[PDB]
Amino acid sequence: NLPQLEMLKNQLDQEVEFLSTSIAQLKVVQTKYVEAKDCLNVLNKSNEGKELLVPLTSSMYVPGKLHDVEHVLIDVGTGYYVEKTAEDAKDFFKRKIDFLTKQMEKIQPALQEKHAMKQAVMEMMSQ
Amino acid sequence: SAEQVIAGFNRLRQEQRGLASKAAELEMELNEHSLVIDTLKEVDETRKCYRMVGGVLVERTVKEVLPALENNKEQIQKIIETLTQQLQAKGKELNEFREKHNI
Amino acid sequence: VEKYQQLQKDLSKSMSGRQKLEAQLTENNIVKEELALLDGSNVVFKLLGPVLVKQELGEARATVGKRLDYITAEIKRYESQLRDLERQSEQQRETLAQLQQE
Amino acid sequence: DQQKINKFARNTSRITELKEEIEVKKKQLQNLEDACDDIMLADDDCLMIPYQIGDVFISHSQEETQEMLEEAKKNLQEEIDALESRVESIQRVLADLKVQLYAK
Amino acid sequence: EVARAQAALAVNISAARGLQDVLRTNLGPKGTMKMLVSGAGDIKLTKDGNVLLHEMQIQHPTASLIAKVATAQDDITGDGTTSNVLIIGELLKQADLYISEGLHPRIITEGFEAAKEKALQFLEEVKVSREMDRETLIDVARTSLRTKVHAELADVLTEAVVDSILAIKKQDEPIDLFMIEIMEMKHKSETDTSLIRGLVLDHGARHPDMKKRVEDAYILTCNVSLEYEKTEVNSGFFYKSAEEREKLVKAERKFIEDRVKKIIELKRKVCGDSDKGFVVINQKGIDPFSLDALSKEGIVALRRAKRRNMERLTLACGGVALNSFDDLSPDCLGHAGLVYEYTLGEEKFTFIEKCNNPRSVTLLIKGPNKHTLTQIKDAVRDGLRAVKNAIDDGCVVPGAGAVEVAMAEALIKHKPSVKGRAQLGVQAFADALLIIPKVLAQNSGFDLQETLVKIQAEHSESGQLVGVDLNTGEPMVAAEVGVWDNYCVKKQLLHSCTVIATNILLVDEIMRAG
Amino acid sequence: AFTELQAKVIDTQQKVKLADIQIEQLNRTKKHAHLTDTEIMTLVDETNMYEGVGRMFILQSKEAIHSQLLEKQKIAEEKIKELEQKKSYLERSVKEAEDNIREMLMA
């Protein structure tokens, strides 16, 4: 009874934290998908011609001039070049936002399943 | 009874770990304030200095970038002493309330 | 017994590169959703290292179609690799445990 | 207390660190080399060939596009020869530390 | 396994024989001492009717029930539990003979009942309403202690016993829940035993003579740390981050000097002078450089105090626990009238008497710190529980067999329930009463038959309650000897005997189950 | 039986812990969007001002950037109302139901 449950409640604590860390990773993945749409919102609205400071590399910025706001690269596949317009790019970002949400949604009751089972072992040891 | 003493000392130790995350989080930033203010003074400051952080560039000069560098370094070293005194005062307070309760 | 962990490490190393493929597997299906909308509206290139090389849309459809097929080829061998390493080690957990006892 | 086995423990650990450095430089060597052959095969000089340097791009010939990768393969391989010249130097002490336990 | 028609009754009565036989010489001053080394595998010196039952590793189910039954008697009386053991096997002896003649146990059980309430009728007849004067309380306390220990040890202890129960009459309490604190003094002779009206503190304040004579004691019973443990943690215990653990160190030394300065403000808050004293009882050790500085301020500061003393000093004297020494009025603290540091043994034992409320009286025995000190501990404990019954009742009776033959004269000769079915159980009942006077005198040398014919005649002659002198073997009148029993005690032993006799008599199968 | 109604309010407690942490972000995002608006309303020297979401920083005049940064604090101002009303609602849902649980189990 009780020595089995004291080993059992400690195992489920890792299984919560292993899944919850995977939730924390996929939020970072959909973070840049929100971030790429909001960069794209300024792009069509402003105009071509405005000066931008973009990273040449890490912590080093190169200036430049802006042209062709209605044609953008989308990085999908295994790392593949896909040229799209800016209008279809917003739809595919929000599609990937709901996709990464869907990746966390299948974990989410199972994340709560490992938490509620551990609490029930805490109750069964208490009862 | 001796259980109120030995458990209250466990309460003061857990606040030492609650003290632990906040002061060292600021302490990592003051050394970044150390390395930045030295490279700016060695390099040319006649051309205009900006302030670049994540998400915003405000077009500035050297005379507006320079004082906040010395300001934000001095504010950190005060708070890491301040956060030490407050949480260690909290460990003294919970011990005497446990001794006056269960007597 | 070192033979217990050795069959597990050879299995788990194959699983880690296999889990890499599955996010690529989904995004190989994402690009086929995006290549189907293109018929000449936007051409495609290929991002391969430090060189970005021109493609066509039919060239793109075969390209992600092959890489979809290479993932599935590495999926099926692991199903052979899963059952073999779990059954060989299960035989080893009985015999090699008796070696350390006597 | 033995100071020769103190040298013998340092010697074997220096054998291990060298061989691992060779393996990671060989995989970088083939990675650049097979990156050369794939991009030449598809679409040589038609109008222009963009080449990645960060996020800005240069348009030039197909063979010069290989040439930046060719140089780094030359720099990497000379290290691999120099790494194996240190793998050989860590073996001569290993044959000689056996006698020095008996000498001193 | 089952126990059938004859055997299930037989194992019960035969076990009641040897239980009564081994526990024979345990009641009264003829009652010999007993040791257990088979109850816990330790050198143990033990005497009571209940305590000997609880220590022995008994497996017979009857003696296990009697240990439960006499527990209810031991909660009220104490001694008298060894009185109950003697009458049970004697009661089972006579009725079994009728069953050995062939008779239902239930008709004898039917005869056990009406025989009992005639004796219960006789207890109101034989009760002797005496005063609860101290010398009358001495005679109860003499026979209670001489049952368990020597008489020379008893009379020294009897002086300390009868004065504390007069102090609980100041609280108008008929019972004894407090004034029962047995404190033990390191000695080599248990011939000495001191009575302190207040309390006894068992410590001596490492730098001595801080203030050893305190005429105005304002007591603070606290447990404040002055030798504070200083830890650096990042995980709840010692961790590997050397960068993190360093910053907590500067606040650790600020706690010790914090508690030293709080003592100074409290002394001027309570006293205002050094003519009025102030006593700090710390449950923990105190810094000796603080014990030097507190001694000059007019403070005695006792250290490492026992946690059992921590509550009882709050009850009689007062003083609540803190972890600070903040400015407190004398209303928040208690008072003691006199504090004196006494020394006997390797420890100083500070006496603290004449409390804010003298509600608990400390019984300080001395002794060689042996099981003899344990043997005098429960002896005075049962000494206090016996005279607890004396404050309960109004009628203190000459006991030791004086009532026992006096009941059996009325029971046998006068049939209460003249119908012959119940008088059979009367005959077993009245012969059960004889076992206490007859065999202890027979143990003393004058055998049981010379004792019975003497005390039956003399009580029928006089009506004065002649008992039995347990040191000669012949009946002497217990009214002048001072071997007395309470009206509260003698009812329950009649009560506890009968109910536990009938149910084990009325079994026919003892089956293994569970 | 009675075990199932225990677990429902316990699962409601962890939804409050999710509700408690959302208001700490949205209060911070309002004030920080207000804080960056103050530093650009501080200067009068230069109308040059860069805005961006990624590591791009487009060249625009500062005055149109103010009114957009006026909208940035405002949407974060709008969300702290709907969350705190929600956070109180989930608090009232679990705590008032918790009054039902313990007093009738201990009964």
PDB file of N, CA and C in Angstrom, chain A residues 14-43:
ATOM      1  N   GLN A  14       7.848  13.760 -12.381  1.00  0.00           N
ATOM      2  CA  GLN A  14       8.704  13.953 -13.545  1.00  0.00           C
ATOM      3  C   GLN A  14       7.882  13.975 -14.824  1.00  0.00           C
ATOM      4  N   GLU A  15       6.822  13.166 -14.873  1.00  0.00           N
ATOM      5  CA  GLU A  15       6.037  13.035 -16.094  1.00  0.00           C
ATOM      6  C   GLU A  15       5.200  14.281 -16.349  1.00  0.00           C
ATOM      7  N   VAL A  16       4.841  15.006 -15.290  1.00  0.00           N
ATOM      8  CA  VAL A  16       4.259  16.331 -15.469  1.00  0.00           C
ATOM      9  C   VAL A  16       5.298  17.287 -16.038  1.00  0.00           C
ATOM     10  N   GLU A  17       6.486  17.313 -15.429  1.00  0.00           N
ATOM     11  CA  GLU A  17       7.498  18.298 -15.789  1.00  0.00           C
ATOM     12  C   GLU A  17       8.109  18.021 -17.153  1.00  0.00           C
ATOM     13  N   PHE A  18       8.137  16.758 -17.575  1.00  0.00           N
ATOM     14  CA  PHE A  18       8.652  16.442 -18.901  1.00  0.00           C
ATOM     15  C   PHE A  18       7.669  16.881 -19.977  1.00  0.00           C
ATOM     16  N   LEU A  19       6.370  16.755 -19.701  1.00  0.00           N
ATOM     17  CA  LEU A  19       5.372  17.215 -20.656  1.00  0.00           C
ATOM     18  C   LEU A  19       5.236  18.730 -20.625  1.00  0.00           C
ATOM     19  N   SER A  20       5.318  19.333 -19.434  1.00  0.00           N
ATOM     20  CA  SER A  20       5.136  20.777 -19.317  1.00  0.00           C
ATOM     21  C   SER A  20       6.306  21.537 -19.925  1.00  0.00           C
ATOM     22  N   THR A  21       7.498  20.937 -19.914  1.00  0.00           N
ATOM     23  CA  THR A  21       8.627  21.537 -20.614  1.00  0.00           C
ATOM     24  C   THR A  21       8.408  21.489 -22.119  1.00  0.00           C
ATOM     25  N   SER A  22       7.809  20.400 -22.611  1.00  0.00           N
ATOM     26  CA  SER A  22       7.483  20.296 -24.030  1.00  0.00           C
ATOM     27  C   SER A  22       6.401  21.293 -24.424  1.00  0.00           C
ATOM     28  N   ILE A  23       5.521  21.650 -23.485  1.00  0.00           N
ATOM     29  CA  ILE A  23       4.585  22.748 -23.719  1.00  0.00           C
ATOM     30  C   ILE A  23       5.338  24.063 -23.832  1.00  0.00           C
ATOM     31  N   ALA A  24       6.352  24.247 -22.983  1.00  0.00           N
ATOM     32  CA  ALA A  24       7.108  25.497 -22.968  1.00  0.00           C
ATOM     33  C   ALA A  24       7.951  25.655 -24.225  1.00  0.00           C
ATOM     34  N   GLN A  25       8.366  24.540 -24.824  1.00  0.00           N
ATOM     35  CA  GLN A  25       9.137  24.608 -26.058  1.00  0.00           C
ATOM     36  C   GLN A  25       8.262  25.014 -27.235  1.00  0.00           C
ATOM     37  N   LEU A  26       7.042  24.478 -27.305  1.00  0.00           N
ATOM     38  CA  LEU A  26       6.202  24.707 -28.475  1.00  0.00           C
ATOM     39  C   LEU A  26       5.583  26.098 -28.452  1.00  0.00           C
ATOM     40  N   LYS A  27       5.513  26.726 -27.275  1.00  0.00           N
ATOM     41  CA  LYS A  27       5.081  28.118 -27.223  1.00  0.00           C
ATOM     42  C   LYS A  27       6.124  29.033 -27.842  1.00  0.00           C
ATOM     43  N   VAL A  28       7.402  28.673 -27.713  1.00  0.00           N
ATOM     44  CA  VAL A  28       8.465  29.447 -28.346  1.00  0.00           C
ATOM     45  C   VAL A  28       8.390  29.293 -29.860  1.00  0.00           C
ATOM     46  N   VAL A  29       7.951  28.121 -30.325  1.00  0.00           N
ATOM     47  CA  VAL A  29       7.839  27.876 -31.758  1.00  0.00           C
ATOM     48  C   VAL A  29       6.715  28.712 -32.357  1.00  0.00           C
ATOM     49  N   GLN A  30       5.597  28.833 -31.641  1.00  0.00           N
ATOM     50  CA  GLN A  30       4.499  29.645 -32.148  1.00  0.00           C
ATOM     51  C   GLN A  30       4.702  31.119 -31.820  1.00  0.00           C
ATOM     52  N   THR A  31       5.692  31.431 -30.973  1.00  0.00           N
ATOM     53  CA  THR A  31       5.995  32.824 -30.651  1.00  0.00           C
ATOM     54  C   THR A  31       6.513  33.564 -31.874  1.00  0.00           C
ATOM     55  N   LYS A  32       7.438  32.945 -32.608  1.00  0.00           N
ATOM     56  CA  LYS A  32       7.961  33.568 -33.815  1.00  0.00           C
ATOM     57  C   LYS A  32       6.932  33.573 -34.938  1.00  0.00           C
ATOM     58  N   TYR A  33       5.914  32.714 -34.854  1.00  0.00           N
ATOM     59  CA  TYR A  33       4.853  32.727 -35.854  1.00  0.00           C
ATOM     60  C   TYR A  33       3.924  33.913 -35.642  1.00  0.00           C
ATOM     61  N   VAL A  34       3.683  34.272 -34.381  1.00  0.00           N
ATOM     62  CA  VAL A  34       3.024  35.536 -34.071  1.00  0.00           C
ATOM     63  C   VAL A  34       3.932  36.699 -34.449  1.00  0.00           C
ATOM     64  N   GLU A  35       5.236  36.535 -34.209  1.00  0.00           N
ATOM     65  CA  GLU A  35       6.204  37.602 -34.435  1.00  0.00           C
ATOM     66  C   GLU A  35       6.395  37.879 -35.923  1.00  0.00           C
ATOM     67  N   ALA A  36       6.275  36.845 -36.759  1.00  0.00           N
ATOM     68  CA  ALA A  36       6.495  37.030 -38.190  1.00  0.00           C
ATOM     69  C   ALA A  36       5.299  37.703 -38.853  1.00  0.00           C
ATOM     70  N   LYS A  37       4.092  37.456 -38.340  1.00  0.00           N
ATOM     71  CA  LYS A  37       2.917  38.150 -38.859  1.00  0.00           C
ATOM     72  C   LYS A  37       2.966  39.635 -38.529  1.00  0.00           C
ATOM     73  N   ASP A  38       3.440  39.971 -37.329  1.00  0.00           N
ATOM     74  CA  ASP A  38       3.421  41.359 -36.888  1.00  0.00           C
ATOM     75  C   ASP A  38       4.542  42.162 -37.536  1.00  0.00           C
ATOM     76  N   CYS A  39       5.627  41.493 -37.935  1.00  0.00           N
ATOM     77  CA  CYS A  39       6.595  42.133 -38.820  1.00  0.00           C
ATOM     78  C   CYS A  39       5.989  42.379 -40.193  1.00  0.00           C
ATOM     79  N   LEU A  40       5.113  41.475 -40.629  1.00  0.00           N
ATOM     80  CA  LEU A  40       4.562  41.556 -41.975  1.00  0.00           C
ATOM     81  C   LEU A  40       3.453  42.596 -42.049  1.00  0.00           C
ATOM     82  N   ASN A  41       2.835  42.904 -40.908  1.00  0.00           N
ATOM     83  CA  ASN A  41       1.784  43.915 -40.876  1.00  0.00           C
ATOM     84  C   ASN A  41       2.348  45.303 -41.152  1.00  0.00           C
ATOM     85  N   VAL A  42       3.570  45.569 -40.689  1.00  0.00           N
ATOM     86  CA  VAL A  42       4.189  46.873 -40.921  1.00  0.00           C
ATOM     87  C   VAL A  42       4.687  46.968 -42.360  1.00  0.00           C
ATOM     88  N   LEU A  43       4.960  45.813 -42.976  1.00  0.00           N
ATOM     89  CA  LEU A  43       5.681  45.769 -44.247  1.00  0.00           C
ATOM     90  C   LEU A  43       4.833  46.293 -45.400  1.00  0.00           C
TER      91      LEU A  43
END
